[PDB]
Amino acid sequence: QYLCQPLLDAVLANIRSPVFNHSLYRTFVPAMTAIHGPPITSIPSVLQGEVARLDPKFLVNLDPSHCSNNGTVHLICKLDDKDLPSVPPLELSVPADYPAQSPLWIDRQWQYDANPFLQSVHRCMTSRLLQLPDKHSVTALLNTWAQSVHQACLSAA
Amino acid sequence: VNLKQAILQAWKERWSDYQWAINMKKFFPKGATWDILNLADALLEQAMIGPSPNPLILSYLKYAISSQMVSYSSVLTAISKFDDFSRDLCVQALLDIMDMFCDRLSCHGKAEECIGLCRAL
């Protein structure tokens, strides 16, 4: 500001002119040249990474059915835990632009029915997924599945 | 990990369905996806021994059917192999078991498994 108002006034009163560059060059090239001399001489990566960094209790892979190589992918899950029994596969669908959103779980009510243990698992599952917050990931849901199975097994015996 | 040897120990003390499943894995290190073992077939052999089929073997068969990793084809072949129509209790139990898991017949796996499922059907 101070000591430089005339330059600001000159620049503002000169701007958006077709010959501004020519004027500036012709008025300021020679002294600068003389004083100093010459001038200077499919599947998104996030899903692949999160699958790579999951606990070896899970071996999730692509669904043999449904579409592929798109923004929305489908995965089928299997649980291999020595301390827990076998449960339905609990497949998932991943929408496009997975970060900053949440995946959804495809419920299969008839699969979990006809057994008190399996429907106890299912009601604990519904409770936990209602307890999960927004913007959650798939690893959190898988861990919730494992913990719900463990809690149901503990409650049974 | 012999079928009869493990089934007898499971039968001697009353066990829940999930505990038996948990235990079976512990008994044999190499499961081999229940193919060589013919676990579904083995249960049937224990079931038909009594004049009235025991409900615990039937429940174990139901649990095995529930898991997708047990093929429906082997159960159907084992059921078809028995026949001999000795008495009404066995055929009624087999009728209930068959009624439970039919009308879906979904098979996931290689194409030759589907071909074998066609022959089993």
Report what the structure shows.
The structure is cut from a larger assembly and holds chains A (157 residues) and B (121 residues). Chain A is built from 5 helices and 4 strands, in the order αααββββαα. Chain A has helices at 5-12, 20-36, 45-52, 116-131, 138-156, and strands spanning 61-62, 73-76, 92-94, 104-105. In chain A, α4 crosses α5. The longest helix of chain A is centred in the C-terminal third of the chain and has 19 residues, at 138-156. By secondary structure, chain B is an all-alpha fold. Chain B has 7 helices and no strands. Chain B is globular, with a radius of gyration of 14 Å. Chain A binds chain B through residues 64, 78, 82-86, 88-89, 114-115, 117-118, 153, 156-157, and chain B through 16-19, 21-22, 25-26, 62-63, 66-69, 100, 108. Chain A: It is found in: Cytoplasm; Nucleus. Chain A: Belongs to the Mediator complex subunit 15 family. Chain A: This is Mediator of RNA polymerase II transcription subunit 15.
